[PDB]
Amino acid sequence: ERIKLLFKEKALEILMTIYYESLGGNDVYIQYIASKVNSPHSYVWLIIKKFEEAKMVECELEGRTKIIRLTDKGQKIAQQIKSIIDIMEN
Amino acid sequence: ERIKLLFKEKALEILMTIYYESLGGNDVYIQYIASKVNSPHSYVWLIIKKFEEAKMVECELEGRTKIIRLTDKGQKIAQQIKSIIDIMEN
């Protein structure tokens, strides 16, 4: 609620989901993402495409499953948003 | 445009306006803000009230002019959003 003041909650949910998921060791599949956020498959996809065009993520198809990886740029942004969320919820 | 993906452009415009204005030496008057952003006086006011309730800004009336000052919390957030904008537009 306090984060929605400055951020687009849904696009943020996606980014941070990708971020925490990747630093966990997992390959980030788009299906897992949609299952973690409050957005339908179509929306997560639209946002993911937007991230990729902004060079924050890079995508790849492995068989029929779409894998999403953060570029260094996407990584730096997620890390700084994390400290802002910390500062926010505190 | 690339910033609107993750951020609420209008609330962001206000915060960064306050931030740059204050580090410039100026007292931040709400009138100057509305004159720098693409938001009507009513909106800048609504957003300012929201910042204050979130303890990012503190307000004060000097005569009939409203002065806005960033709390340490508001300051840290603005500084980190700045590096994200740098990273973004680059």
Query: Closest-CA residue in chain B for A56?
Result: B88
Q: Where are the domains of chain B?
A: 1-90
CB atoms within 10 A of CB B1: 6
Picking from A50, A54, A83, the nearest residue to B80 by CB comes out as A83
Residues of A in contact with B88 (CB under 8 A): 77
User: Does the distance separating the beta carbons of B15 and A11 come in below 8 Å?
Assistant: no
User: Does the distance separating the beta carbons of B77 and A80 come in below 8 Å?
Assistant: no
Q: Render A18-49 in DSSP notation, one character per residue.
A: HHHHHTTT--EEHHHHHHHSSS-HHHHHHHHH
Q: How many CA atoms lie within 13 A of B59 on its CB side?
A: 17
The experimental resolution of this structure, in angstroms, equals: 2.3
Whole-angstrom Cα distance, residue A65 to residue A53?
20
User: CATH for A1-90?
Assistant: 1.10.10.10
Whole-angstrom Cα distance, residue B83 to residue B7?
14
User: For the purposes of burial, counting CB atoms within 10 Å of the CB of B24, is it exposed (0-12), middle (13-18) or buried (19 or more)?
Assistant: exposed
Give A44→chain B minimum CA distance, Å. Answer: 13
Q: Which of A33, A36, A19, A27 is nearest to A70 (CA)?
A: A19
User: Does the distance separating the beta carbons of A80 and B88 come in below 8 Å?
Assistant: no
Is residue B57 within 8 A of residue B44, CB to CB? The reply is no
Given CB atoms, is B49 within the 8 Å cutoff of chain A? no
Whole-angstrom Cα distance, residue B51 to residue B57?
6
Tokens standing for residue A34: 């949609």
User: Does the distance separating the beta carbons of A5 and B8 come in below 8 Å?
Assistant: yes
Place of tokens 């299906």: A31
Is residue B14 within 8 A of residue B33, CB to CB? The reply is yes
